Amino acid sequence: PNFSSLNLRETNLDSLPLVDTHSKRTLLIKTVETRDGQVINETSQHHDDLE
Amino acid sequence: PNFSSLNLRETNLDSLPLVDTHSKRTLLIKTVETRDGQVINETSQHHDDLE
Amino acid sequence: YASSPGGVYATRSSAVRLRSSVPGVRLLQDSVDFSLADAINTEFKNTRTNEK
Amino acid sequence: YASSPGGVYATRSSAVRLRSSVPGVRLLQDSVDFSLADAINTEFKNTRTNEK
Amino acid sequence: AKQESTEYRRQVQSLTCEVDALKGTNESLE
Amino acid sequence: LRRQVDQLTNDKARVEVERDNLAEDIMRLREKLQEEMLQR
Amino acid sequence: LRRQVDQLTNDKARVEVERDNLAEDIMRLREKLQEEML
Amino acid sequence: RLQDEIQNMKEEMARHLREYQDLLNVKMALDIEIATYRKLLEGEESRISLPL
Amino acid sequence: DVDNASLARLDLERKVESLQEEIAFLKKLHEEEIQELQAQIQEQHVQIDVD
Amino acid sequence: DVDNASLARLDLERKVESLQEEIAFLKKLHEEEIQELQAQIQEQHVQIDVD
């Protein structure tokens, strides 16, 4: 009876790294470059950071 | 084997790629209403809609 | 005589699922424990170890 | 001895033709018949049958 | 290979409009 | 659940960077049209 | 997984088709502002 | 890309057709092995005056 | 469709995390399935055969 | 980067899609490996009267 080899596993306690809370920090730097008031560029830098 | 004991659970595997559930999804609708090349209105409507 | 109905109706419903164009359905994927199944796998090891 | 309690089978549902895009973040299912495990639930019990 | 064939399609479409505009500038000088 | 939360994350922050470039186009065609309107 | 594989198979084919159509549909809206300023 | 997803679902349907017929071959194996253990058992009825 | 697709790149970091613990539950399932095959081999044979 | 970011999504998703059809294929083939075990249990029918 050397059981705990089963042990009906241990498909595990699963503190695994499957996280996004770990938050998905959507730093949306919407750089609206206007000239005179007209939009010339919108450099929308989505830094899509997973903390 | 005496088959068991069991750890099958999602200790940080749940806490999934779920962000809240919400990507901190800061939808900044910066409506730059320009006329004749000049800004006439700059309505920066934030939504923080869940994702 | 045990005429007893061991089969209970596991009641399903599916009323007609309208235009779910509302996007607000967050994802969650939370499963499975079920540590009672690994306790039952350990009770099958224990019941074999008693049978031994 | 009656099959399909309550008369049940998977009757066709078909709704309004909602064209949602769905980006399809899969739960993969490593239990697409993990079945080797349920033949093994029968062998976690054939192991009990031989010992008995 | 389909994604590369889609990026070179954007380079094609951008460079077509750029040289069509330089040709349209030479016809405007003409 | 992951695919549903992910599709809501994508549709959210899509509109965040869509909007800010679409506010720049709608200014870039206006700068032209407003300076032409002053002369006109 | 295949739901998101079918998502690019819309996305890619759509951005390629919308590029080569709106090139003429918006170029033929700048050509008419050139008519108004010449 | 929908013929990939659909013909992969028709592969796994076509696999489940052969695997359900493998489960019928496990049944039909037990039907003939019960029958041919009966072809042992006329000789085991002979073997102690015994299992008919 | 790129802001969607680049948030979708961060979805695979979460889905590959989730599927790596699914493949860990499927590996634990193979280890339980091998213990069950050894139980089934002992369970089908201790009655002493045909007699 | 619509094409690149959604193709970086797909080149991983097609690998997991193919590997999950290959796991289904390996498991509808492992049905035949358990059928060679069930064939051993079917052949054990076989032997003589004990004591």
JSON list of N, CA, C and O in Angstrom, two decimals, chain B residues 1-10 13-14 18 21 50-51, chain C residues 26-27 31-35 38-39 41-47:
[
{"chain": "B", "resi": 1, "resn": "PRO", "atom": "N", "xyz": [-2.51, 1.32, -6.31]},
{"chain": "B", "resi": 1, "resn": "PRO", "atom": "CA", "xyz": [-2.79, 2.47, -5.45]},
{"chain": "B", "resi": 1, "resn": "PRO", "atom": "C", "xyz": [-4.21, 2.48, -4.87]},
{"chain": "B", "resi": 1, "resn": "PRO", "atom": "O", "xyz": [-5.19, 2.47, -5.61]},
{"chain": "B", "resi": 2, "resn": "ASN", "atom": "N", "xyz": [-4.31, 2.85, -3.59]},
{"chain": "B", "resi": 2, "resn": "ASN", "atom": "CA", "xyz": [-5.51, 3.49, -3.07]},
{"chain": "B", "resi": 2, "resn": "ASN", "atom": "C", "xyz": [-5.60, 4.91, -3.65]},
{"chain": "B", "resi": 2, "resn": "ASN", "atom": "O", "xyz": [-4.70, 5.71, -3.42]},
{"chain": "B", "resi": 3, "resn": "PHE", "atom": "N", "xyz": [-6.51, 5.11, -4.60]},
{"chain": "B", "resi": 3, "resn": "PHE", "atom": "CA", "xyz": [-6.28, 5.95, -5.78]},
{"chain": "B", "resi": 3, "resn": "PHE", "atom": "C", "xyz": [-5.93, 7.42, -5.53]},
{"chain": "B", "resi": 3, "resn": "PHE", "atom": "O", "xyz": [-5.46, 8.06, -6.46]},
{"chain": "B", "resi": 4, "resn": "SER", "atom": "N", "xyz": [-6.36, 8.00, -4.40]},
{"chain": "B", "resi": 4, "resn": "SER", "atom": "CA", "xyz": [-6.66, 9.43, -4.29]},
{"chain": "B", "resi": 4, "resn": "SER", "atom": "C", "xyz": [-5.97, 10.12, -3.09]},
{"chain": "B", "resi": 4, "resn": "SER", "atom": "O", "xyz": [-4.74, 10.09, -3.04]},
{"chain": "B", "resi": 5, "resn": "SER", "atom": "N", "xyz": [-6.68, 11.03, -2.41]},
{"chain": "B", "resi": 5, "resn": "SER", "atom": "CA", "xyz": [-6.32, 12.47, -2.35]},
{"chain": "B", "resi": 5, "resn": "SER", "atom": "C", "xyz": [-6.39, 13.15, -3.73]},
{"chain": "B", "resi": 5, "resn": "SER", "atom": "O", "xyz": [-6.31, 12.47, -4.76]},
{"chain": "B", "resi": 6, "resn": "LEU", "atom": "N", "xyz": [-6.71, 14.44, -3.74]},
{"chain": "B", "resi": 6, "resn": "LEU", "atom": "CA", "xyz": [-6.90, 15.24, -4.95]},
{"chain": "B", "resi": 6, "resn": "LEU", "atom": "C", "xyz": [-6.59, 16.72, -4.67]},
{"chain": "B", "resi": 6, "resn": "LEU", "atom": "O", "xyz": [-7.34, 17.38, -3.95]},
{"chain": "B", "resi": 7, "resn": "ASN", "atom": "N", "xyz": [-5.65, 17.28, -5.43]},
{"chain": "B", "resi": 7, "resn": "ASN", "atom": "CA", "xyz": [-5.65, 18.70, -5.79]},
{"chain": "B", "resi": 7, "resn": "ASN", "atom": "C", "xyz": [-5.75, 18.80, -7.31]},
{"chain": "B", "resi": 7, "resn": "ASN", "atom": "O", "xyz": [-4.73, 18.71, -7.99]},
{"chain": "B", "resi": 8, "resn": "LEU", "atom": "N", "xyz": [-6.97, 19.00, -7.79]},
{"chain": "B", "resi": 8, "resn": "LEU", "atom": "CA", "xyz": [-7.26, 19.67, -9.05]},
{"chain": "B", "resi": 8, "resn": "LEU", "atom": "C", "xyz": [-8.08, 20.90, -8.70]},
{"chain": "B", "resi": 8, "resn": "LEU", "atom": "O", "xyz": [-9.17, 20.77, -8.13]},
{"chain": "B", "resi": 9, "resn": "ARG", "atom": "N", "xyz": [-7.46, 22.07, -8.80]},
{"chain": "B", "resi": 9, "resn": "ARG", "atom": "CA", "xyz": [-8.09, 23.38, -8.59]},
{"chain": "B", "resi": 9, "resn": "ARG", "atom": "C", "xyz": [-7.29, 24.44, -9.33]},
{"chain": "B", "resi": 9, "resn": "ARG", "atom": "O", "xyz": [-6.08, 24.31, -9.45]},
{"chain": "B", "resi": 10, "resn": "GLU", "atom": "N", "xyz": [-7.90, 25.60, -9.51]},
{"chain": "B", "resi": 10, "resn": "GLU", "atom": "CA", "xyz": [-7.31, 26.65, -10.32]},
{"chain": "B", "resi": 10, "resn": "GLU", "atom": "C", "xyz": [-6.90, 27.83, -9.41]},
{"chain": "B", "resi": 10, "resn": "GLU", "atom": "O", "xyz": [-7.67, 28.75, -9.19]},
{"chain": "B", "resi": 13, "resn": "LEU", "atom": "N", "xyz": [-4.48, 29.74, -11.92]},
{"chain": "B", "resi": 13, "resn": "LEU", "atom": "CA", "xyz": [-4.89, 29.39, -13.28]},
{"chain": "B", "resi": 13, "resn": "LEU", "atom": "C", "xyz": [-6.28, 29.99, -13.60]},
{"chain": "B", "resi": 13, "resn": "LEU", "atom": "O", "xyz": [-6.44, 30.57, -14.67]},
{"chain": "B", "resi": 14, "resn": "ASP", "atom": "N", "xyz": [-7.19, 29.99, -12.61]},
{"chain": "B", "resi": 14, "resn": "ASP", "atom": "CA", "xyz": [-8.28, 30.96, -12.45]},
{"chain": "B", "resi": 14, "resn": "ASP", "atom": "C", "xyz": [-7.83, 32.04, -11.46]},
{"chain": "B", "resi": 14, "resn": "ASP", "atom": "O", "xyz": [-6.89, 31.82, -10.70]},
{"chain": "B", "resi": 18, "resn": "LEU", "atom": "N", "xyz": [-8.29, 36.83, -17.50]},
{"chain": "B", "resi": 18, "resn": "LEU", "atom": "CA", "xyz": [-9.34, 37.74, -17.08]},
{"chain": "B", "resi": 18, "resn": "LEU", "atom": "C", "xyz": [-8.67, 38.95, -16.43]},
{"chain": "B", "resi": 18, "resn": "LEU", "atom": "O", "xyz": [-8.00, 38.81, -15.42]},
{"chain": "B", "resi": 21, "resn": "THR", "atom": "N", "xyz": [-13.09, 40.93, -14.96]},
{"chain": "B", "resi": 21, "resn": "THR", "atom": "CA", "xyz": [-12.92, 41.07, -16.43]},
{"chain": "B", "resi": 21, "resn": "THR", "atom": "C", "xyz": [-13.17, 42.50, -16.93]},
{"chain": "B", "resi": 21, "resn": "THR", "atom": "O", "xyz": [-14.28, 43.03, -16.78]},
{"chain": "B", "resi": 50, "resn": "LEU", "atom": "N", "xyz": [-16.28, 47.73, -19.83]},
{"chain": "B", "resi": 50, "resn": "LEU", "atom": "CA", "xyz": [-15.74, 46.44, -19.42]},
{"chain": "B", "resi": 50, "resn": "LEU", "atom": "C", "xyz": [-15.36, 45.59, -20.66]},
{"chain": "B", "resi": 50, "resn": "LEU", "atom": "O", "xyz": [-15.88, 45.82, -21.76]},
{"chain": "B", "resi": 51, "resn": "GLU", "atom": "N", "xyz": [-14.33, 44.76, -20.50]},
{"chain": "B", "resi": 51, "resn": "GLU", "atom": "CA", "xyz": [-13.64, 43.98, -21.56]},
{"chain": "B", "resi": 51, "resn": "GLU", "atom": "C", "xyz": [-12.98, 42.72, -20.99]},
{"chain": "B", "resi": 51, "resn": "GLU", "atom": "O", "xyz": [-13.78, 41.78, -20.82]},
{"chain": "C", "resi": 26, "resn": "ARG", "atom": "N", "xyz": [-18.46, 39.74, -20.20]},
{"chain": "C", "resi": 26, "resn": "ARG", "atom": "CA", "xyz": [-17.07, 39.49, -19.76]},
{"chain": "C", "resi": 26, "resn": "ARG", "atom": "C", "xyz": [-16.75, 37.99, -19.86]},
{"chain": "C", "resi": 26, "resn": "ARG", "atom": "O", "xyz": [-17.60, 37.16, -19.53]},
{"chain": "C", "resi": 27, "resn": "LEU", "atom": "N", "xyz": [-15.50, 37.67, -20.16]},
{"chain": "C", "resi": 27, "resn": "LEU", "atom": "CA", "xyz": [-14.98, 36.31, -20.04]},
{"chain": "C", "resi": 27, "resn": "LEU", "atom": "C", "xyz": [-14.61, 36.00, -18.58]},
{"chain": "C", "resi": 27, "resn": "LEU", "atom": "O", "xyz": [-14.02, 36.84, -17.90]},
{"chain": "C", "resi": 31, "resn": "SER", "atom": "N", "xyz": [-12.51, 26.86, -13.41]},
{"chain": "C", "resi": 31, "resn": "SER", "atom": "CA", "xyz": [-12.68, 25.40, -13.33]},
{"chain": "C", "resi": 31, "resn": "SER", "atom": "C", "xyz": [-11.44, 24.73, -12.69]},
{"chain": "C", "resi": 31, "resn": "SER", "atom": "O", "xyz": [-10.34, 25.25, -12.84]},
{"chain": "C", "resi": 32, "resn": "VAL", "atom": "N", "xyz": [-11.51, 23.54, -12.09]},
{"chain": "C", "resi": 32, "resn": "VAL", "atom": "CA", "xyz": [-12.64, 22.58, -12.06]},
{"chain": "C", "resi": 32, "resn": "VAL", "atom": "C", "xyz": [-12.95, 22.00, -10.67]},
{"chain": "C", "resi": 32, "resn": "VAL", "atom": "O", "xyz": [-14.08, 21.57, -10.48]},
{"chain": "C", "resi": 33, "resn": "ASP", "atom": "N", "xyz": [-11.99, 22.01, -9.74]},
{"chain": "C", "resi": 33, "resn": "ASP", "atom": "CA", "xyz": [-11.97, 21.35, -8.41]},
{"chain": "C", "resi": 33, "resn": "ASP", "atom": "C", "xyz": [-13.37, 21.07, -7.81]},
{"chain": "C", "resi": 33, "resn": "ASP", "atom": "O", "xyz": [-14.09, 21.99, -7.43]},
{"chain": "C", "resi": 34, "resn": "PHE", "atom": "N", "xyz": [-13.88, 19.82, -7.80]},
{"chain": "C", "resi": 34, "resn": "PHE", "atom": "CA", "xyz": [-13.34, 18.51, -8.24]},
{"chain": "C", "resi": 34, "resn": "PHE", "atom": "C", "xyz": [-12.20, 17.85, -7.45]},
{"chain": "C", "resi": 34, "resn": "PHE", "atom": "O", "xyz": [-11.97, 16.67, -7.68]},
{"chain": "C", "resi": 35, "resn": "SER", "atom": "N", "xyz": [-11.72, 18.41, -6.34]},
{"chain": "C", "resi": 35, "resn": "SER", "atom": "CA", "xyz": [-10.85, 17.69, -5.38]},
{"chain": "C", "resi": 35, "resn": "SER", "atom": "C", "xyz": [-11.55, 16.49, -4.73]},
{"chain": "C", "resi": 35, "resn": "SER", "atom": "O", "xyz": [-10.89, 15.50, -4.41]},
{"chain": "C", "resi": 38, "resn": "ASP", "atom": "N", "xyz": [-10.42, 13.51, -6.81]},
{"chain": "C", "resi": 38, "resn": "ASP", "atom": "CA", "xyz": [-9.10, 13.05, -6.35]},
{"chain": "C", "resi": 38, "resn": "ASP", "atom": "C", "xyz": [-9.11, 12.43, -4.95]},
{"chain": "C", "resi": 38, "resn": "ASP", "atom": "O", "xyz": [-8.40, 11.45, -4.70]},
{"chain": "C", "resi": 39, "resn": "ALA", "atom": "N", "xyz": [-10.09, 12.81, -4.12]},
{"chain": "C", "resi": 39, "resn": "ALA", "atom": "CA", "xyz": [-10.47, 12.06, -2.93]},
{"chain": "C", "resi": 39, "resn": "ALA", "atom": "C", "xyz": [-11.08, 10.70, -3.29]},
{"chain": "C", "resi": 39, "resn": "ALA", "atom": "O", "xyz": [-10.55, 9.70, -2.83]},
{"chain": "C", "resi": 41, "resn": "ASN", "atom": "N", "xyz": [-10.45, 9.05, -6.21]},
{"chain": "C", "resi": 41, "resn": "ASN", "atom": "CA", "xyz": [-9.27, 8.33, -6.72]},
{"chain": "C", "resi": 41, "resn": "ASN", "atom": "C", "xyz": [-8.39, 7.80, -5.58]},
{"chain": "C", "resi": 41, "resn": "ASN", "atom": "O", "xyz": [-7.81, 6.72, -5.68]},
{"chain": "C", "resi": 42, "resn": "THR", "atom": "N", "xyz": [-8.31, 8.54, -4.48]},
{"chain": "C", "resi": 42, "resn": "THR", "atom": "CA", "xyz": [-7.62, 8.11, -3.25]},
{"chain": "C", "resi": 42, "resn": "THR", "atom": "C", "xyz": [-8.43, 7.05, -2.49]},
{"chain": "C", "resi": 42, "resn": "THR", "atom": "O", "xyz": [-7.86, 6.03, -2.14]},
{"chain": "C", "resi": 43, "resn": "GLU", "atom": "N", "xyz": [-9.76, 7.12, -2.48]},
{"chain": "C", "resi": 43, "resn": "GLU", "atom": "CA", "xyz": [-10.65, 6.07, -1.98]},
{"chain": "C", "resi": 43, "resn": "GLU", "atom": "C", "xyz": [-10.64, 4.81, -2.85]},
{"chain": "C", "resi": 43, "resn": "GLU", "atom": "O", "xyz": [-10.71, 3.72, -2.31]},
{"chain": "C", "resi": 44, "resn": "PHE", "atom": "N", "xyz": [-10.37, 4.90, -4.16]},
{"chain": "C", "resi": 44, "resn": "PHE", "atom": "CA", "xyz": [-10.12, 3.73, -5.01]},
{"chain": "C", "resi": 44, "resn": "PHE", "atom": "C", "xyz": [-8.75, 3.09, -4.74]},
{"chain": "C", "resi": 44, "resn": "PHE", "atom": "O", "xyz": [-8.69, 1.86, -4.62]},
{"chain": "C", "resi": 45, "resn": "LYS", "atom": "N", "xyz": [-7.71, 3.89, -4.47]},
{"chain": "C", "resi": 45, "resn": "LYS", "atom": "CA", "xyz": [-6.42, 3.37, -3.96]},
{"chain": "C", "resi": 45, "resn": "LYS", "atom": "C", "xyz": [-6.58, 2.73, -2.58]},
{"chain": "C", "resi": 45, "resn": "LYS", "atom": "O", "xyz": [-6.10, 1.62, -2.39]},
{"chain": "C", "resi": 46, "resn": "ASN", "atom": "N", "xyz": [-7.33, 3.35, -1.67]},
{"chain": "C", "resi": 46, "resn": "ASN", "atom": "CA", "xyz": [-7.60, 2.83, -0.33]},
{"chain": "C", "resi": 46, "resn": "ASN", "atom": "C", "xyz": [-8.46, 1.57, -0.38]},
{"chain": "C", "resi": 46, "resn": "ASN", "atom": "O", "xyz": [-8.06, 0.57, 0.19]},
{"chain": "C", "resi": 47, "resn": "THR", "atom": "N", "xyz": [-9.48, 1.52, -1.23]},
{"chain": "C", "resi": 47, "resn": "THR", "atom": "CA", "xyz": [-10.34, 0.34, -1.39]},
{"chain": "C", "resi": 47, "resn": "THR", "atom": "C", "xyz": [-9.57, -0.83, -2.01]},
{"chain": "C", "resi": 47, "resn": "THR", "atom": "O", "xyz": [-9.57, -1.89, -1.41]}
]
